[PDB]
Structure 1
Amino acid sequence: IDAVDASTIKRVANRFIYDKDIAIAAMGPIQRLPDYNWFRRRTYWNRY
């Protein structure tokens, strides 16, 4: 556990999170929930 520092966090995050597909499931009054493309585009940043 204590062998997982900031660099390893960034590496694993860039392996698993950055620019990958997602799965969603919602229930209730979800008429005001952003569509798929919103979530899918928000998995990377254009600032950097």
Structure 2
Amino acid sequence: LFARIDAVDASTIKRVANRFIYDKDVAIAAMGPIQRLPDYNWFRRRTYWNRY
């Protein structure tokens, strides 16, 4: 388990995040005074950067 854990480096983290996070679909569940929480398109757009 320790070998598997410390076999994770920065490049591995980037590759896994690009596999799971970059431009994927989020699922939001909210309750309460959420009248100021941004809508779905906001999060879906925030899942990627246009600078890079």
TM-score band w.r.t. shorter chain: over 0.9
Q: Which of structure 1's runs of 4+ aligned residues deviate more than 3 A?
A: none
- Partner residue of 1:3 out of 4, 7, 13: 7
Provide the C-alpha distance between the structure 2 equivalents of 1:34 and 1:43, rounded to a whole number of angstroms.
14
Q: Deviations over 1:4-48 (max 9, x none)?
A: 011100000000000000100001000111011000000000001
Which of these two proteins has the greater Rg computed from alpha carbons?
A: 2
Larger relative helix fraction: 2
Over the matched positions of the two proteins, sequence identity in percent amounts to: 98
- TM-score (ref. length: structure 2): 0.89
Structure 1 residues not aligned, in runs of 5+:
none
Q: C-alpha separation between the residues in 2 aligned to 1:9 and 1:22?
A: 19
> Aligned residue pairs: how many?
48
Specify which structure has the bigger relative contact order, considering alpha-carbon pairs within 8 angstroms and separated by 6 or more residues: 1
